[PDB]
Each structure stands twice: as structure tokens, then as C-alpha cells.
Amino acid sequence: QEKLKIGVVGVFAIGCLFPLLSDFKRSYPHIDLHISTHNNRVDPAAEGLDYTIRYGGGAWHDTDAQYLCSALMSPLCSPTLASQIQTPADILKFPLLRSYRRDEWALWMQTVGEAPPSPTHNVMVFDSAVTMLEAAQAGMGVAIAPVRMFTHLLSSERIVQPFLTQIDLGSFWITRLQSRPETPAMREFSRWLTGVLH
Amino acid sequence: QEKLKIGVVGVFAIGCLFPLLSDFKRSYPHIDLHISTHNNRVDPAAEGLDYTIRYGGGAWHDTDAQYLCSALMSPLCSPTLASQIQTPADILKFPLLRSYRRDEWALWMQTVGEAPPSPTHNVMVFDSAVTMLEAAQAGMGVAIAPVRMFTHLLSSERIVQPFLTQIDLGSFWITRLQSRPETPAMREFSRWLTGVLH
């Protein structure tokens, strides 16, 4: 077996990669895949990773970065909250849930023609979109995250997307440190993943 | 308003703290609470936190640590997986899901009188118990995590605890850097939380 160690941002692992892993095993049985998750804030050298699947803009320095897929973001909330939401302004009836990035809600609101939320607005901050959406399901507030990573919650009707407008503040990328040697197994995994996504 | 900034381990935020936050607001309306989540691997100084709610043994150096509650761990899996699990050995029909700690499964199995899982066993590693349990619900494998933090999944029947045996590899603690000044709002929040838990 050829070892491959991969650190995957949690939202991507649950929303995309995990369901597809048996297909990787089908195509490449000879690969010993060591999967670990992170919250997008990761040090691949320290963790001894071969690849890192992450969210961002693709321009990490001294990194070989390959595009996986888009991660368009939109408001997401429980059906109970959604019942009280008709216009974008109605989102402000409730606390906002955001990631460590400070601009998500300002940008989305601006795109839909609203003013920025009051600097006084009740806001909760999440290291992980997976945790954010757990809070959202429980009606803790309105989340903003990559819609396609929560198809499972949308289809099962645990979360609703009240508005069509989406924003791009990053995509999903797979990255190798340029100081890290690219192996046969790495090339094969990269080929499989960018391939199965298309 | 008095500002209070708190970084909370995700599993505790979803499984315990979030449901209780309106009760804090009832008792202490004058507090401006800034909640953020982390994956238990956090630097409170860098993040400028007042308090950190975390999982561990209570003996962080140069930290004032206060015990919140126990976090006994047991195997957790989907009903479909559980249907194929009668004895602890049956867990090994499926991949194991673990945290960054390397000893959880060895310890639990040893406690129930089994041998350690093969060093060859399919294992997936999670920065966050919240993400682990999402994977577990989807039948990706059998998780091990703090049972009382997933009452929501147990009650709704999305996850099952097949065995009664639990282990203690850590509890939940609230910690302040000794170099960080203890404020009025901090004392009041600490008092409320240790209080509402009892």
C-alpha cells in the first residue's frame, strides 16, 4: 500500500468528499488514505500532511494549489426562522452567524442592496461551518456558508436557503507545500478528485 | 454594556452552552457576550479571549481552570450500523472515527475487555467531535465522543449508543490565562454557568 495523508476542511469532508471516498477506493485500491479534518486553519508541515483541502483564494505563497470547486455563499436558516423571513431585511430579526472572516454579512447585504448590519447586532462566530450549521438548525440565528456543502440539510429540510443571491468569498482548493514532494499517490488522488467533481 | 469575550469548544457550544444562553441573558442582561467557537486547539492570548471553554484535564500551566462538567465517552453510530452491532467486537466491522488523541479506541476496548484494534484498521481523524458525529450519522464509521454533548442526536434517534461502558479522557473546563485580568463580567458568567449546570 502507498500511504497518502490528507487534511480536509470539515465542511468539505462532510459536504463533498466523504460520500465519494468509496469511489476513490474503487479506482485506486492500492492507496492507504489517511484522512484527517481541520477547521481551515491548519499547518500542513507541522501535521505532516501530503495534501490540504481548504477554503480560500488559491494564492497561498510557496504552495502548489489546484482548484476543486466553487463555494458560493448564501443565508441559511431553519424552517421556523425562514417562516419569518420574506425580504433580506428580515434576516435582522435574528442573530447572525459568521466565520472568522469579518466581511461575509456586510458583503452579502451590500450585494442585495441593503445597508450593513448594525455594529451592535447580535453575532456568533464559528471556526467551522459545520458547527455554524448545527447552531443554525437549532434556530440560534441565520448562517452564511457554502450552499453546495449543505445539500444534505437542504434536501432533508433541516435548513432552508430563503434567498437566491450568492456571493464568492473563496472556493475549495487542494494544496501541496512546494517543499513537499509530490508522490504517485498524490497525483492519482488529485486526478480522481478533480475528475469525479466534473 | 460590559464586554465578555469567550471562545467555546464547538462540541460544548452545540451540546450544552447554546441552549442555555437565553438564561444567561435573563440573569445578566448588562453583559455584552462575544461568543466564538474553536476545535479545542486554541490560543486565547492571540484571539484576545477572556475565557476559554475547553476539553481536557484541568492542569494547563499558568491557567486558572474551573471545572464545568464530565465528558464520559462511549461508541456512537447510526441506527443502521447499530443494527449490525451486538458485541464490542462488532464495532470493528466498520471504520473507527477518532479525535486527534491517539488512545481513545485502545482505551475503550481495553476497558471492555477487548484487544486493541489492528494498526491496519481503517481510521478517520477529526479536529472536532461535531464533525465526527456528522460523519457518524452518515454511517462513515463508529465515533467515540462525549455522550452528553450529543443528547440532541440520541433523542432524535440520529445516533445510537450501543454500549453502556463509558471512559474518562477529559472533562469540560473554563479557563483564564493568569496573565488575563478577571473582570466582573467574567465572574458573573462563571457563576451562572457552573450554577446552571448544577
Side-chain angles (χ1 to χ4, degrees), chain B residues 88-128:
Chain B
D90 287 341
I91 291 175
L92 300 177
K93 293 178 183 183
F94 308 103
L96 301 175
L97 318 174
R98 75 161 169 93
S99 81
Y100 275 42
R101 191 163 167 97
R102 289 171 192 268
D103 56 356
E104 298 165 319
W105 279 109
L107 300 165
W108 190 86
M109 286 302 194
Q110 178 186 65
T111 297
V112 300
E114 301 289 333
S118 179
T120 308
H121 208 91
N122 295 329
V123 163
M124 294 173 270
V125 181
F126 294 85
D127 68 307
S128 166

mmCIF file of all heavy atoms in Angstrom, chain B residues 88-128:
data_model
loop_
_atom_site.group_PDB
_atom_site.id
_atom_site.type_symbol
_atom_site.label_atom_id
_atom_site.label_comp_id
_atom_site.label_asym_id
_atom_site.label_seq_id
_atom_site.Cartn_x
_atom_site.Cartn_y
_atom_site.Cartn_z
ATOM 1 N N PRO B 88 -18.986 -5.643 21.562
ATOM 2 C CA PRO B 88 -17.977 -4.625 21.246
ATOM 3 C C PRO B 88 -17.099 -4.993 20.041
ATOM 4 O O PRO B 88 -16.712 -4.111 19.270
ATOM 5 C CB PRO B 88 -17.147 -4.554 22.531
ATOM 6 C CG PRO B 88 -18.107 -4.936 23.613
ATOM 7 C CD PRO B 88 -19.019 -5.966 23.002
ATOM 8 N N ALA B 89 -16.782 -6.276 19.884
ATOM 9 C CA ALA B 89 -16.007 -6.736 18.734
ATOM 10 C C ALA B 89 -16.640 -6.347 17.388
ATOM 11 O O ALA B 89 -15.928 -6.134 16.399
ATOM 12 C CB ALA B 89 -15.799 -8.258 18.817
ATOM 13 N N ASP B 90 -17.971 -6.254 17.357
ATOM 14 C CA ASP B 90 -18.723 -5.936 16.140
ATOM 15 C C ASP B 90 -18.462 -4.522 15.626
ATOM 16 O O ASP B 90 -18.654 -4.238 14.441
ATOM 17 C CB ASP B 90 -20.228 -6.119 16.361
ATOM 18 C CG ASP B 90 -20.643 -7.580 16.437
ATOM 19 O OD1 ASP B 90 -19.877 -8.453 15.978
ATOM 20 O OD2 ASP B 90 -21.751 -7.845 16.953
ATOM 21 N N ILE B 91 -18.032 -3.633 16.517
ATOM 22 C CA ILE B 91 -17.654 -2.281 16.112
ATOM 23 C C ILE B 91 -16.623 -2.342 14.973
ATOM 24 O O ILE B 91 -16.651 -1.527 14.051
ATOM 25 C CB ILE B 91 -17.106 -1.471 17.312
ATOM 26 C CG1 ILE B 91 -18.227 -1.158 18.303
ATOM 27 C CG2 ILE B 91 -16.444 -0.173 16.850
ATOM 28 C CD1 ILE B 91 -17.753 -0.468 19.566
ATOM 29 N N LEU B 92 -15.742 -3.339 15.029
ATOM 30 C CA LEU B 92 -14.657 -3.498 14.050
ATOM 31 C C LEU B 92 -15.095 -3.979 12.657
ATOM 32 O O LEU B 92 -14.263 -4.153 11.762
ATOM 33 C CB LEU B 92 -13.553 -4.395 14.619
ATOM 34 C CG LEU B 92 -12.913 -3.844 15.894
ATOM 35 C CD1 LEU B 92 -11.877 -4.798 16.441
ATOM 36 C CD2 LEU B 92 -12.302 -2.467 15.632
ATOM 37 N N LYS B 93 -16.396 -4.180 12.472
ATOM 38 C CA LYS B 93 -16.942 -4.384 11.144
ATOM 39 C C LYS B 93 -16.793 -3.100 10.332
ATOM 40 O O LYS B 93 -16.838 -3.116 9.102
ATOM 41 C CB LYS B 93 -18.425 -4.758 11.216
ATOM 42 C CG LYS B 93 -18.737 -6.107 11.833
ATOM 43 C CD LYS B 93 -20.244 -6.303 11.863
ATOM 44 C CE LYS B 93 -20.650 -7.606 12.530
ATOM 45 N NZ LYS B 93 -22.135 -7.778 12.455
ATOM 46 N N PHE B 94 -16.608 -1.987 11.029
ATOM 47 C CA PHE B 94 -16.683 -0.662 10.404
ATOM 48 C C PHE B 94 -15.453 0.180 10.726
ATOM 49 O O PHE B 94 -14.784 -0.074 11.727
ATOM 50 C CB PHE B 94 -17.945 0.048 10.909
ATOM 51 C CG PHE B 94 -19.198 -0.773 10.764
ATOM 52 C CD1 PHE B 94 -19.766 -1.407 11.863
ATOM 53 C CD2 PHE B 94 -19.803 -0.927 9.523
ATOM 54 C CE1 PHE B 94 -20.912 -2.160 11.728
ATOM 55 C CE2 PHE B 94 -20.958 -1.685 9.386
ATOM 56 C CZ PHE B 94 -21.505 -2.302 10.492
ATOM 57 N N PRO B 95 -15.147 1.194 9.883
ATOM 58 C CA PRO B 95 -14.076 2.149 10.222
ATOM 59 C C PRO B 95 -14.294 2.795 11.601
ATOM 60 O O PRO B 95 -15.434 2.910 12.065
ATOM 61 C CB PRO B 95 -14.200 3.222 9.134
ATOM 62 C CG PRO B 95 -14.840 2.528 7.976
ATOM 63 C CD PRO B 95 -15.789 1.516 8.596
ATOM 64 N N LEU B 96 -13.205 3.193 12.249
ATOM 65 C CA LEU B 96 -13.288 3.909 13.514
ATOM 66 C C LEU B 96 -13.094 5.408 13.257
ATOM 67 O O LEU B 96 -12.296 5.803 12.409
ATOM 68 C CB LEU B 96 -12.228 3.393 14.490
ATOM 69 C CG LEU B 96 -12.290 1.896 14.848
ATOM 70 C CD1 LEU B 96 -11.112 1.490 15.735
ATOM 71 C CD2 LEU B 96 -13.615 1.530 15.505
ATOM 72 N N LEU B 97 -13.851 6.232 13.967
ATOM 73 C CA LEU B 97 -13.675 7.673 13.909
ATOM 74 C C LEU B 97 -13.106 8.119 15.258
ATOM 75 O O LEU B 97 -13.625 7.727 16.307
ATOM 76 C CB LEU B 97 -15.017 8.364 13.631
ATOM 77 C CG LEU B 97 -15.902 7.698 12.564
ATOM 78 C CD1 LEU B 97 -17.275 8.367 12.442
ATOM 79 C CD2 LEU B 97 -15.184 7.644 11.185
ATOM 80 N N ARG B 98 -12.036 8.910 15.229
ATOM 81 C CA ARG B 98 -11.354 9.355 16.451
ATOM 82 C C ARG B 98 -10.984 10.839 16.379
ATOM 83 O O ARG B 98 -11.024 11.455 15.310
ATOM 84 C CB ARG B 98 -10.093 8.520 16.717
ATOM 85 C CG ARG B 98 -8.903 8.857 15.795
ATOM 86 C CD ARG B 98 -7.584 8.362 16.386
ATOM 87 N NE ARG B 98 -6.462 8.422 15.447
ATOM 88 C CZ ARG B 98 -5.614 9.443 15.334
ATOM 89 N NH1 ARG B 98 -5.759 10.520 16.094
ATOM 90 N NH2 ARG B 98 -4.620 9.392 14.450
ATOM 91 N N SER B 99 -10.634 11.414 17.522
ATOM 92 C CA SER B 99 -10.117 12.779 17.576
ATOM 93 C C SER B 99 -8.602 12.755 17.355
ATOM 94 O O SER B 99 -8.032 11.711 17.058
ATOM 95 C CB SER B 99 -10.417 13.412 18.935
ATOM 96 O OG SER B 99 -9.463 12.995 19.896
ATOM 97 N N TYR B 100 -7.941 13.877 17.510
ATOM 98 C CA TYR B 100 -6.514 13.943 17.378
ATOM 99 C C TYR B 100 -5.691 13.142 18.409
ATOM 100 O O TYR B 100 -4.577 12.826 18.175
ATOM 101 C CB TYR B 100 -6.098 15.380 17.348
ATOM 102 C CG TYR B 100 -6.146 16.070 16.017
ATOM 103 C CD1 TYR B 100 -7.180 15.905 15.145
ATOM 104 C CD2 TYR B 100 -5.125 16.888 15.646
ATOM 105 C CE1 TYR B 100 -7.185 16.584 13.894
ATOM 106 C CE2 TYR B 100 -5.127 17.553 14.475
ATOM 107 C CZ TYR B 100 -6.144 17.405 13.588
ATOM 108 O OH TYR B 100 -6.051 18.104 12.450
ATOM 109 N N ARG B 101 -6.315 12.812 19.524
ATOM 110 C CA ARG B 101 -5.791 11.919 20.554
ATOM 111 C C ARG B 101 -5.637 10.517 19.991
ATOM 112 O O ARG B 101 -6.493 10.057 19.359
ATOM 113 C CB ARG B 101 -6.752 11.955 21.718
ATOM 114 C CG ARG B 101 -6.275 11.325 22.963
ATOM 115 C CD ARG B 101 -7.056 11.739 24.148
ATOM 116 N NE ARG B 101 -6.785 10.915 25.289
ATOM 117 C CZ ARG B 101 -5.940 11.235 26.230
ATOM 118 N NH1 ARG B 101 -5.257 12.339 26.156
ATOM 119 N NH2 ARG B 101 -5.755 10.423 27.212
ATOM 120 N N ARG B 102 -4.525 9.836 20.200
ATOM 121 C CA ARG B 102 -4.356 8.548 19.568
ATOM 122 C C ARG B 102 -4.845 7.324 20.359
ATOM 123 O O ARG B 102 -4.881 6.255 19.838
ATOM 124 C CB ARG B 102 -2.925 8.346 19.134
ATOM 125 C CG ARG B 102 -2.559 9.188 17.993
ATOM 126 C CD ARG B 102 -1.153 9.161 17.715
ATOM 127 N NE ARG B 102 -0.812 10.204 16.783
ATOM 128 C CZ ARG B 102 -0.757 10.096 15.464
ATOM 129 N NH1 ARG B 102 -1.026 8.962 14.849
ATOM 130 N NH2 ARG B 102 -0.367 11.164 14.770
ATOM 131 N N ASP B 103 -5.239 7.523 21.588
ATOM 132 C CA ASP B 103 -5.524 6.462 22.543
ATOM 133 C C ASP B 103 -7.021 6.091 22.825
ATOM 134 O O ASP B 103 -7.260 5.203 23.578
ATOM 135 C CB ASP B 103 -4.888 6.883 23.855
ATOM 136 C CG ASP B 103 -5.375 8.277 24.340
ATOM 137 O OD1 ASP B 103 -6.116 8.961 23.678
ATOM 138 O OD2 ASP B 103 -5.012 8.713 25.409
ATOM 139 N N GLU B 104 -7.988 6.813 22.248
ATOM 140 C CA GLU B 104 -9.388 6.678 22.628
ATOM 141 C C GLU B 104 -9.938 5.281 22.417
ATOM 142 O O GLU B 104 -10.494 4.710 23.288
ATOM 143 C CB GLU B 104 -10.270 7.693 21.914
ATOM 144 C CG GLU B 104 -9.927 9.107 22.226
ATOM 145 C CD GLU B 104 -10.529 10.074 21.273
ATOM 146 O OE1 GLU B 104 -10.557 9.838 20.107
ATOM 147 O OE2 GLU B 104 -10.951 11.044 21.727
ATOM 148 N N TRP B 105 -9.732 4.763 21.233
ATOM 149 C CA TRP B 105 -10.227 3.427 20.927
ATOM 150 C C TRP B 105 -9.486 2.298 21.659
ATOM 151 O O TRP B 105 -10.102 1.312 22.070
ATOM 152 C CB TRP B 105 -10.253 3.187 19.413
ATOM 153 C CG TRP B 105 -11.480 3.803 18.780
ATOM 154 C CD1 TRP B 105 -11.522 4.897 17.967
ATOM 155 C CD2 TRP B 105 -12.834 3.383 18.962
ATOM 156 N NE1 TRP B 105 -12.828 5.180 17.619
ATOM 157 C CE2 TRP B 105 -13.650 4.259 18.212
ATOM 158 C CE3 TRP B 105 -13.440 2.338 19.672
ATOM 159 C CZ2 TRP B 105 -15.036 4.130 18.161
ATOM 160 C CZ3 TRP B 105 -14.820 2.207 19.615
ATOM 161 C CH2 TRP B 105 -15.602 3.100 18.871
ATOM 162 N N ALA B 106 -8.171 2.435 21.805
ATOM 163 C CA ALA B 106 -7.392 1.458 22.562
ATOM 164 C C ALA B 106 -7.901 1.388 23.998
ATOM 165 O O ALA B 106 -8.176 0.306 24.527
ATOM 166 C CB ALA B 106 -5.894 1.809 22.522
ATOM 167 N N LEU B 107 -8.053 2.552 24.613
ATOM 168 C CA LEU B 107 -8.546 2.648 25.985
ATOM 169 C C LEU B 107 -9.965 2.093 26.164
ATOM 170 O O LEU B 107 -10.226 1.329 27.088
ATOM 171 C CB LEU B 107 -8.471 4.100 26.454
ATOM 172 C CG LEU B 107 -7.035 4.641 26.427
ATOM 173 C CD1 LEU B 107 -6.996 6.154 26.527
ATOM 174 C CD2 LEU B 107 -6.165 3.986 27.517
ATOM 175 N N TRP B 108 -10.890 2.468 25.286
ATOM 176 C CA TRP B 108 -12.260 1.976 25.435
ATOM 177 C C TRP B 108 -12.340 0.451 25.296
ATOM 178 O O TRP B 108 -12.924 -0.232 26.149
ATOM 179 C CB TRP B 108 -13.233 2.676 24.471
ATOM 180 C CG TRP B 108 -14.663 2.343 24.796
ATOM 181 C CD1 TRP B 108 -15.469 2.976 25.699
ATOM 182 C CD2 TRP B 108 -15.434 1.265 24.250
ATOM 183 N NE1 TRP B 108 -16.706 2.361 25.743
ATOM 184 C CE2 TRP B 108 -16.710 1.310 24.858
ATOM 185 C CE3 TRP B 108 -15.174 0.267 23.300
ATOM 186 C CZ2 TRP B 108 -17.719 0.401 24.544
ATOM 187 C CZ3 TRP B 108 -16.174 -0.637 22.991
ATOM 188 C CH2 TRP B 108 -17.433 -0.565 23.612
ATOM 189 N N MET B 109 -11.745 -0.073 24.231
ATOM 190 C CA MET B 109 -11.679 -1.516 24.000
ATOM 191 C C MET B 109 -11.033 -2.279 25.171
ATOM 192 O O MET B 109 -11.518 -3.347 25.589
ATOM 193 C CB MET B 109 -10.887 -1.809 22.718
ATOM 194 C CG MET B 109 -11.634 -1.502 21.417
ATOM 195 S SD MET B 109 -13.169 -2.421 21.297
ATOM 196 C CE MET B 109 -13.542 -2.198 19.565
ATOM 197 N N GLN B 110 -9.920 -1.749 25.661
ATOM 198 C CA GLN B 110 -9.234 -2.337 26.812
ATOM 199 C C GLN B 110 -10.152 -2.378 28.041
ATOM 200 O O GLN B 110 -10.180 -3.364 28.783
ATOM 201 C CB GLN B 110 -7.954 -1.562 27.126
ATOM 202 C CG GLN B 110 -7.169 -2.067 28.345
ATOM 203 C CD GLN B 110 -5.990 -1.160 28.688
ATOM 204 O OE1 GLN B 110 -6.177 -0.007 29.070
ATOM 205 N NE2 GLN B 110 -4.772 -1.680 28.550
ATOM 206 N N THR B 111 -10.900 -1.301 28.252
ATOM 207 C CA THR B 111 -11.820 -1.218 29.374
ATOM 208 C C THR B 111 -12.931 -2.263 29.264
ATOM 209 O O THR B 111 -13.380 -2.800 30.280
ATOM 210 C CB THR B 111 -12.424 0.193 29.513
ATOM 211 O OG1 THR B 111 -11.378 1.134 29.789
ATOM 212 C CG2 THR B 111 -13.437 0.239 30.640
ATOM 213 N N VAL B 112 -13.368 -2.565 28.038
ATOM 214 C CA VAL B 112 -14.443 -3.547 27.857
ATOM 215 C C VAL B 112 -13.939 -4.971 27.644
ATOM 216 O O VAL B 112 -14.727 -5.890 27.397
ATOM 217 C CB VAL B 112 -15.461 -3.150 26.743
ATOM 218 C CG1 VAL B 112 -16.120 -1.836 27.086
ATOM 219 C CG2 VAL B 112 -14.794 -3.084 25.387
ATOM 220 N N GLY B 113 -12.629 -5.150 27.760
ATOM 221 C CA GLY B 113 -12.038 -6.476 27.743
ATOM 222 C C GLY B 113 -11.673 -6.999 26.365
ATOM 223 O O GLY B 113 -11.457 -8.201 26.205
ATOM 224 N N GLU B 114 -11.596 -6.108 25.376
ATOM 225 C CA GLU B 114 -11.146 -6.487 24.032
ATOM 226 C C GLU B 114 -9.674 -6.145 23.797
ATOM 227 O O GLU B 114 -9.062 -5.382 24.557
ATOM 228 C CB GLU B 114 -11.992 -5.808 22.948
ATOM 229 C CG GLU B 114 -13.485 -6.112 22.986
ATOM 230 C CD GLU B 114 -13.815 -7.539 22.571
ATOM 231 O OE1 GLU B 114 -13.048 -8.148 21.790
ATOM 232 O OE2 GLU B 114 -14.855 -8.053 23.028
ATOM 233 N N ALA B 115 -9.113 -6.704 22.727
ATOM 234 C CA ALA B 115 -7.761 -6.377 22.308
ATOM 235 C C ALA B 115 -7.779 -5.040 21.569
ATOM 236 O O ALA B 115 -8.838 -4.559 21.171
ATOM 237 C CB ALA B 115 -7.198 -7.477 21.410
ATOM 238 N N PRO B 116 -6.604 -4.424 21.401
ATOM 239 C CA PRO B 116 -6.567 -3.187 20.619
ATOM 240 C C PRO B 116 -6.896 -3.470 19.156
ATOM 241 O O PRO B 116 -6.546 -4.534 18.639
ATOM 242 C CB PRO B 116 -5.111 -2.730 20.752
ATOM 243 C CG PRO B 116 -4.580 -3.450 21.962
ATOM 244 C CD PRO B 116 -5.292 -4.762 21.979
ATOM 245 N N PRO B 117 -7.583 -2.531 18.496
ATOM 246 C CA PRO B 117 -7.829 -2.638 17.057
ATOM 247 C C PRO B 117 -6.511 -2.761 16.283
ATOM 248 O O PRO B 117 -5.512 -2.148 16.665
ATOM 249 C CB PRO B 117 -8.508 -1.304 16.727
ATOM 250 C CG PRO B 117 -9.097 -0.851 18.026
ATOM 251 C CD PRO B 117 -8.120 -1.281 19.061
ATOM 252 N N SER B 118 -6.523 -3.549 15.213
ATOM 253 C CA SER B 118 -5.372 -3.689 14.328
ATOM 254 C C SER B 118 -4.809 -2.331 13.919
ATOM 255 O O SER B 118 -5.561 -1.412 13.600
ATOM 256 C CB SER B 118 -5.766 -4.486 13.081
ATOM 257 O OG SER B 118 -4.675 -4.623 12.190
ATOM 258 N N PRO B 119 -3.476 -2.196 13.929
ATOM 259 C CA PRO B 119 -2.820 -0.964 13.478
ATOM 260 C C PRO B 119 -3.129 -0.714 12.008
ATOM 261 O O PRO B 119 -2.804 0.342 11.478
ATOM 262 C CB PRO B 119 -1.328 -1.272 13.654
ATOM 263 C CG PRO B 119 -1.277 -2.392 14.643
ATOM 264 C CD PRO B 119 -2.509 -3.200 14.404
ATOM 265 N N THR B 120 -3.776 -1.650 11.364
ATOM 266 C CA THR B 120 -4.169 -1.596 9.973
ATOM 267 C C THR B 120 -5.656 -1.124 9.778
ATOM 268 O O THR B 120 -6.149 -0.984 8.686
ATOM 269 C CB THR B 120 -4.021 -3.000 9.465
ATOM 270 O OG1 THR B 120 -2.720 -3.461 9.793
ATOM 271 C CG2 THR B 120 -4.265 -3.129 8.033
ATOM 272 N N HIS B 121 -6.357 -0.936 10.881
ATOM 273 C CA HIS B 121 -7.760 -0.627 10.811
ATOM 274 C C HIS B 121 -8.049 0.689 10.155
ATOM 275 O O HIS B 121 -7.392 1.639 10.399
ATOM 276 C CB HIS B 121 -8.402 -0.646 12.189
ATOM 277 C CG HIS B 121 -9.848 -0.982 12.157
ATOM 278 N ND1 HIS B 121 -10.315 -2.257 12.264
ATOM 279 C CD2 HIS B 121 -10.925 -0.205 12.003
ATOM 280 C CE1 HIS B 121 -11.617 -2.253 12.177
ATOM 281 N NE2 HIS B 121 -12.011 -1.023 12.018
ATOM 282 N N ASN B 122 -9.058 0.724 9.314
ATOM 283 C CA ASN B 122 -9.484 1.958 8.677
ATOM 284 C C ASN B 122 -9.900 2.956 9.762
ATOM 285 O O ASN B 122 -10.800 2.668 10.522
ATOM 286 C CB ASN B 122 -10.610 1.715 7.671
ATOM 287 C CG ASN B 122 -10.174 0.862 6.472
ATOM 288 O OD1 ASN B 122 -9.047 0.909 6.063
ATOM 289 N ND2 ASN B 122 -11.063 0.084 5.941
ATOM 290 N N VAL B 123 -9.206 4.096 9.812
ATOM 291 C CA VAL B 123 -9.473 5.120 10.820
ATOM 292 C C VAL B 123 -9.533 6.514 10.197
ATOM 293 O O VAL B 123 -8.675 6.865 9.395
ATOM 294 C CB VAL B 123 -8.382 5.100 11.911
ATOM 295 C CG1 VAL B 123 -8.407 6.391 12.723
ATOM 296 C CG2 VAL B 123 -8.544 3.879 12.807
ATOM 297 N N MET B 124 -10.549 7.298 10.559
ATOM 298 C CA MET B 124 -10.600 8.713 10.174
ATOM 299 C C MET B 124 -10.492 9.626 11.399
ATOM 300 O O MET B 124 -11.091 9.355 12.450
ATOM 301 C CB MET B 124 -11.874 9.032 9.377
ATOM 302 C CG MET B 124 -11.946 8.334 8.011
ATOM 303 S SD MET B 124 -13.541 8.539 7.164
ATOM 304 C CE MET B 124 -14.467 7.131 7.755
ATOM 305 N N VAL B 125 -9.751 10.719 11.241
ATOM 306 C CA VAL B 125 -9.363 11.588 12.348
ATOM 307 C C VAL B 125 -10.033 12.954 12.233
ATOM 308 O O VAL B 125 -10.032 13.566 11.160
ATOM 309 C CB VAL B 125 -7.822 11.758 12.360
ATOM 310 C CG1 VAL B 125 -7.366 12.648 13.522
ATOM 311 C CG2 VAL B 125 -7.142 10.383 12.393
ATOM 312 N N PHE B 126 -10.595 13.428 13.347
ATOM 313 C CA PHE B 126 -11.402 14.643 13.377
ATOM 314 C C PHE B 126 -10.896 15.688 14.352
ATOM 315 O O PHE B 126 -10.645 15.380 15.523
ATOM 316 C CB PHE B 126 -12.841 14.262 13.740
ATOM 317 C CG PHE B 126 -13.502 13.422 12.692
ATOM 318 C CD1 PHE B 126 -13.323 12.051 12.675
ATOM 319 C CD2 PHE B 126 -14.239 14.017 11.684
ATOM 320 C CE1 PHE B 126 -13.907 11.278 11.693
ATOM 321 C CE2 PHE B 126 -14.814 13.261 10.704
ATOM 322 C CZ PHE B 126 -14.662 11.872 10.712
ATOM 323 N N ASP B 127 -10.768 16.925 13.867
ATOM 324 C CA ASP B 127 -10.362 18.040 14.712
ATOM 325 C C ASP B 127 -11.491 18.373 15.667
ATOM 326 O O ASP B 127 -11.276 18.982 16.704
ATOM 327 C CB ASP B 127 -10.018 19.277 13.868
ATOM 328 C CG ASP B 127 -11.230 19.874 13.192
ATOM 329 O OD1 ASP B 127 -11.953 19.130 12.490
ATOM 330 O OD2 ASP B 127 -11.465 21.093 13.345
ATOM 331 N N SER B 128 -12.700 17.942 15.318
ATOM 332 C CA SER B 128 -13.893 18.365 16.039
ATOM 333 C C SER B 128 -14.875 17.218 16.184
ATOM 334 O O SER B 128 -15.214 16.566 15.191
ATOM 335 C CB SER B 128 -14.570 19.499 15.270
ATOM 336 O OG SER B 128 -15.889 19.726 15.762
#
